[PDB]
């Protein structure tokens, strides 16, 4: 059963917010929303759809964060001449996945930016 402010799906509680916060902060914020809170993790298409229909009906149309960050940061990066990554000139330090109320698609925005978000916990 979930707080009166949360929506229930398969033994989990999802609640979307509207205070644009960076990735780290929006993930900070979620742990303080309920014992075991964190940003939204989509373990499936069904769960992901439910969350999408949910963010829609509420705030109608905007971009929400998700439980993925430092996505490509630990990928194996090397130049095509076989050289290792040493010098750096990245325009953005890290990327964070985020979705938007229109569809269940994973997008990527620089982490240190701002967007809405959906928090979740279980039971």
């Amino acid at each position: 059963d979930c707080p009166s402010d949360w929506s229930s799906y398969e033994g989990h509680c999802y609640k979307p917010f509207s205070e644009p916060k960076n990735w780290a902060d929006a993930e900070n914020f979620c742990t303080q929303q309920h014992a075991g809170g964190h940003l939204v993790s989509f373990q499936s298409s069904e769960e992901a759809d439910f969350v999408v229909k949910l963010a829609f009906q509420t705030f109608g149309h905007s971009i929400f964060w998700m439980g993925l960050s430092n996505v490509w940061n630990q990928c194996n990066w090397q130049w095509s001449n076989a050289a290792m990554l040493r010098y750096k000139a990245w325009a953005e330090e890290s990327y964070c996945v985020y979705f938007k109320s229109t569809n269940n698609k994973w997008r990527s925005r620089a982490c240190r930016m701002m967007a809405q978000f959906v928090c979740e916990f279980q039971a």
């Binding site: 993930e27 979620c30 964190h38 940003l39 993790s41 989509f42 373990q43 499936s44 298409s45 992901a48 439980g67 993925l68 960050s69 430092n70 996505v71 490509w72 940061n73 630990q74 990928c75 194996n76 990066w77 090397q78 130049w79 095509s80 001449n81 050289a83 990554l85 040493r86 010098y87 750096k88 000139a89 990245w90 325009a91 953005e92 990327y95 996945v97 269940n104 698609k105 994973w106 997008r107 990527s108």
Partner: protein
């Protein structure tokens, strides 16, 4: 001193090409342009300023990126093992254009910065030998 049309900087030759190819294709195209050729590798500050002067002085005629040799040599559309709650990320629905795994350069940033871009793009490039 380099072949006709290549520019030199610290014992290497560079050639800006105004062909719109995918990363995979601009890379294959560079190997077959000189002995041991590849897409430019920016491994130093001076080297980067030089590639920027070059790209600016040569490519800048139709708004876009300029490929560079850096790429996640792998098949992971993302490489972050888990979600914030500590679960394994094993379900996906990425927009392909949205997994920005190849890098580029651009005028917006005076061709001095690496921008995460979609590998299926078709942009010019700089080869190096």
């Amino acid at each position: 001193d380099c072949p006709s049309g290549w520019s030199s900087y610290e014992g290497h030759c560079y050639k800006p090409f105004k062909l719109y190819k995918t990363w995979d294709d601009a890379e294959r195209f560079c190997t077959e342009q000189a002995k041991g050729g590849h897409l430019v590798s920016i491994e130093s500050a001076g080297e980067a300023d030089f590639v920027a002067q070059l790209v600016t002085e040569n490519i800048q005629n139709t708004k876009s990126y300029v490929w560079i040799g850096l790429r996640v040599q792998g098949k992971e559309k993302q490489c972050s093992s888990e979600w914030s709650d500590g679960s394994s990320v094993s379900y996906e629905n990425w927009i392909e254009a949205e997994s920005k795994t190849c890098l580029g350069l651009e005028k917006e940033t005076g061709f001095r910065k690496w921008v995460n871009i979609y590998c299926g793009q078709q942009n010019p490039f700089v080869c190096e030998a």
